[PDB]
Paper text:
Boron, essential for plant growth, necessitates precise regulation due to its potential toxicity. This regulation is achieved by borate transporters (BORs), which are homologous to the SLC4 family. The Arabidopsis thaliana Bor1 (AtBor1) transporter from clade I undergoes slow regulation through degradation and translational suppression, but its potential for fast regulation via direct activity modulation was unclear. Our findings show that AtBor1 is regulated by two distinct mechanisms: an autoinhibitory domain at the carboxyl terminus obstructs the substrate pathway via conserved salt bridges, and phosphorylation of Thr410 allows interaction with a positively charged pocket at the cytosolic face, essential for borate transport.
Full-length AtBor1 was overexpressed in Saccharomyces cerevisiae, purified in phosphatidylcholine lipid nanodiscs, and the structure determined at 2.3 Å using cryo-EM. Particle expansion, 3D classification, and local refinement of one protomer improved the resolution to 2.15 Å, allowing the unambiguous building of an atomic model with robust side chain densities, doughnut-shaped aromatic rings, and water molecules in the cryo-EM density map. Our 2.15 Å structure of the wild-type transporter is solved in the inward-autoinhibited (IAI) conformation and reveals previously unknown detail, including C-terminal (Ct) domain swapping within the AtBor1 dimer. Importantly, we were able to resolve the Ct domain and construct the model up to residue 645. This revealed that the Ct domain comprises two α helices (H11 and H12) connected by a loop, followed by a rigid hairpin that deeply inserts into the cytosolic cavity of the neighboring protomer in a domain-swapped manner to block the permeation pathway like a “plug”. Therefore, we define our full-length AtBor1 structure as the IAI conformation. Specifically, Arg637, Glu641, Arg643 and His644 on the Ct hairpin form salt bridges with Glu502 on TM12, Arg153 on TM5, Glu604 on LH10-H11 and Glu323 on H5, respectively. Interestingly, Arg639 on the Ct hairpin does not form direct polar interactions with surrounding residues, but its guanidinium group forms a polar interaction with a nearby water molecule, which, in turn, forms a polar interaction with Arg153 on TM5.
Numbering used by the authors:
A (entry chain B): 624 to 645
B (entry chain A): 5 to 276, 281 to 373, 457 to 630
């Protein structure tokens, strides 16, 4: 299963670190 | 807006968790070093790049020594007595631009010259500190909820444009003779200059492409988990090291300065407070320093607050309170100190602060953040120690740093909804179903395309006007005012032209996303109602 940083990599924008709401 | 009320509440809240803020960091053991090293590398490389930019722009008065020293001292002080330790401080590009404007102004006036630039900058910093004190005391941080997306993303794209412009300027300059160098060296013959320029292109593009690729390592299917995480976390410094090593390959057969390496001097070499020179500045210019001081104060009031907000997103499930007012007050004090010491001021930086919070997070299978002061203190101390290691850092070719500038510009884009809307504006009308076939912003489905187009055209015109303003020799220092005016514009003018829910969708506080739709569902939509069928060669 994916690690914490692997998961957080997908839900946070790279430009500004904003959480994505889907 | 009761004076001192916000500061008092912040201090009362943060004084109840100080000792825990330290012991929790101590209780983490040696595992606190991984986030510390990650954030240290995220902080150091851009600050060195900005130091080189200043070295070029101030004729050597300010270099990477000063930017690193400012970052380190401000970070250490903020870690010890700051309100929100998750916030990372550093010298940023808007500060570099403002200082470049100030140096250009000072160099052209006989009364100031290059010998009083740092004294006049000290006065500018004094004015800025006073303005930030007033803003913090009067509770101006209560209205930071009005710093909406329209301003933040426009500012981000403007900084991205400036980054790319700097990369281009540096790469162009690699082909020329530097201003303050012995022009008779073999390094500067036309043949060797052409060779240096082409080698710089190779190195910068290698750095950029490899660094961009490394960012997605955690989603690869090769290697081990720890190796993938290592690449994803330290790709940038690793690629900087790799391309430095590459640059040393032809060292045996080329002149000394091929390729060109960092221009910042070594502080250890015998050749090497501005208060004494501050009293030598004429009174007229002491008063006139109020003009750039207000713009710098506006910049810091915006950026510090936004960085802290990003670091404190509610999805992090943080348990300790915020300190916006007190942190603005401390930033004022730090700006005063930096001005008195002859270094540019530091402020909260993006995306370093949210990335710090993320690096401190774990999922309890549900985000839990280890909030303490040790990580910030240690990373600031390491940034300070980079000053002693300047001889090692002087081995980095400048082209690698120009590539890093391009990297920062391109990395400004991925989560920027303004950039997404520009790309959508350039999309062929019959190919928008392709936009609906992947993850996309919700306004793409909930807002008519005409409204999106008008909103984007207005924003793009504003951005281009600001970028052009930065090119005007003297008035360019007013661009933070252009940024600030977007707040009242959004609050009062936009509602007249745009309708309610559409403005809310296009300027949402949270990042709203929708999953990919099936083709049969991407065709019923208004935006995807003009689906042209593919050709034979497309099949």
């Amino acid at each position: 299963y994916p690690g914490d940083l692997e998961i957080l990599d997908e839900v946070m924008t790279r430009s500004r670190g904003e959480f994505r709401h889907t």
